[PDB]
Amino acid sequence: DKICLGHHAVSNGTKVNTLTERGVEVVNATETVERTNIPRICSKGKRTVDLGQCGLLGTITGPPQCDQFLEFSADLIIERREGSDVCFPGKFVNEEALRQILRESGGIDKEAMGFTYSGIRTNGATSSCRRSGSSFYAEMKWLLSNTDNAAFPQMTKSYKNTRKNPALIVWGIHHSGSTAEQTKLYGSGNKLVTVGSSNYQQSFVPSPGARTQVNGQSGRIDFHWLMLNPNDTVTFSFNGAFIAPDRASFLRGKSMGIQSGVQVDADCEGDCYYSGGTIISNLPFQNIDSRAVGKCPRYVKQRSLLLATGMKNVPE
C-alpha cells in the first residue's frame, strides 16, 4: 500500500550555527573549542626540571635556589611564578631574549674558562645567600681586589670556545650601593670594562648606586649576554668592577619549556602547555589560553563553536 523514506529525530537535540541563521537544531554535534584543562603538567616520557624558587634565567648563574640544577639535560623546562633569578639584586640587560633561547635550549652544559690571576677573592661576601655563609653565586667571582685601599689590576682574560657548539657567555657588572662602596670595595678611581669579540665590541661602566634596599642590600648586578660562533674568541679587557664567570654555557637541543604555576603530573602525556595547566585534547580550537606552547589547538575568542555531526532535527 504505502512505503515511506524518512530520517531519524530526537525529542531534544543541540543547537549549532550556520552561514544563514543561528540556533539551528541538529540531533548531534560535537565541540571544536576545548574548555576543559588538566590542572597539572603532563610531562610523562619527557625529561623535566621542576625549578622552584629559582627562575629559568638563573640556571646559568647559579642562585642558591637551584645550585643542584646548574648542569642538566631536559626535554621540558618549567619556570615558576615564585622563581627568582637573583641572590644579590640585579637584572639582565636583554632578559627576554636570553630566557627565550633557554626555553629552546634543551638544558645546559658547561666548560670552565679560568681567570687564574692573583689579588682576587673568589667568595665575594654577600648576605643574600646562606648556603654555608656569606658568598656570591656558585658560578661567578667578585673581583674585589685586596680588600680596602686596593687598586684593581688590569685583566685581559679570553676564552677560545674550542668545541663545535656556539657558546653562551654570561658575565656581569656590579653597581655598588654608594660611592664609598666603589672606593673601598673595588678601590678608588674610574671603572672601565670592555668586552670584545668578532661581533660584540661593547664597553660598560659601573656607577654608584644609591638605590633602594631591595632584599636589604642596595646596588644591582648587570648580567650581560654574549653569543659566540664556533671557534670564535671572547675577550674580557677590564680594570673596573667585574663579575667574572667561571664557566661558559652550551646548548643541548630542543625544549619548548613552559612557564607554569601548577604541579607536575608524570603519569599523563601531552604537548600543549599554558601557565594554568595543559591541554591534551585533539580539538582544533581552544578558548583557555592564547599563550600556548607546542602542538596545541589554535586560540579563538568564542567560548564554544559546535560542529554538527548529525542532520537537521525536525521532531514529530
Binding site: 504505502k2 523514506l5 530520517h7 571544536t32 627562575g55 585533539n282 579563538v300 560542529l307 525536525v314
Partner: protein, 167 residues
C-alpha cells in the same frame, strides 16, 4: 499517520540514520538503509578527521607573564597576537558555520539522492506522495521492501496493473 523526511523525522529510528518505514495491510514496521547511513557516517567521520588534524607547528613563548616585556615590544606583540586571534576567531567561526551548512545540506543531498534512487527504482509503478511517502499501486509485502532496501527491486512486476490503477 506515516510521514517522511519532507515534513518530519522518525523519533523511533535508533539503529541507523536513514531508513524505510513500511505501512501496509501485511503488517507494519521500520528498517534501516545500511548503505545510506554507512556512507553518511563515514563521510562525516572523514570530515571530523580533517577537523582534528594537528598543527604540527610548535610555538615558543614570545611574551612573558612573570616579568613583563618592554612596553614597545610588548605593545607590538599584543597588537600582533590580537590580530592573529581575530584572524583565527574569524576562520574558526567561518569554518564551523560553513561546515555546519555543508553538513546539513549534505545530509539533505543524501536524503534527496536516496529518494531519487527509490523513485528511479520504482519508475512507473509508484508515485510520490509529496511528504516522503511513495504510493505503491500494486499489492506487495515485506519481500519487496527488502528488495528495495537491498537495491534489488525490479519494476517488471505486473506493470499494467499499476498503470490501470493510476490511469
Amino acid at each position: 499517520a506515516i510521514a517522511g523526511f519532507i515534513e518530519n523525522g522518525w523519533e523511533g529510528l535508533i539503529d541507523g540514520w536513514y531508513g524505510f518505514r513500511h505501512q501496509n495491510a501485511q503488517g507494519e514496521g521500520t528498517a534501516a538503509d545500511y548503505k545510506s547511513t554507512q556512507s553518511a557516517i563515514d563521510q562525516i567521520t572523514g570530515k571530523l578527521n580533517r577537523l582534528i588534524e594537528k598543527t604540527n607547528q610548535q610555538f615558543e613563548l614570545i611574551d612573558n607573564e612573570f616579568t613583563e616585556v618592554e612596553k614597545q615590544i610588548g605593545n607590538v606583540i599584543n597588537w600582533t597576537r590580537d590580530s592573529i586571534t581575530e584572524v583565527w576567531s574569524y576562520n574558526a567561526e567561518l569554518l564551523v558555520a560553513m561546515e555546519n551548512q555543508h553538513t546539513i545540506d549534505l545530509a539533505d543531498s543524501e536524503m534527496d539522492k536516496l529518494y531519487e534512487r527509490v523513485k528511479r527504482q520504482l519508475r512507473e509503478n509508484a508515485e510520490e506522495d509529496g511528504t516522503g511517502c511513495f504510493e505503491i499501486f500494486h499489492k506487495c509485502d515485506d519481500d519487496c521492501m527488502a528488495s528495495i532496501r537491498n537495491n534489488t527491486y525490479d519494476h517488471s512486476k505486473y506493470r499494467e496493473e499499476a498503470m490501470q490503477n493510476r490511469i
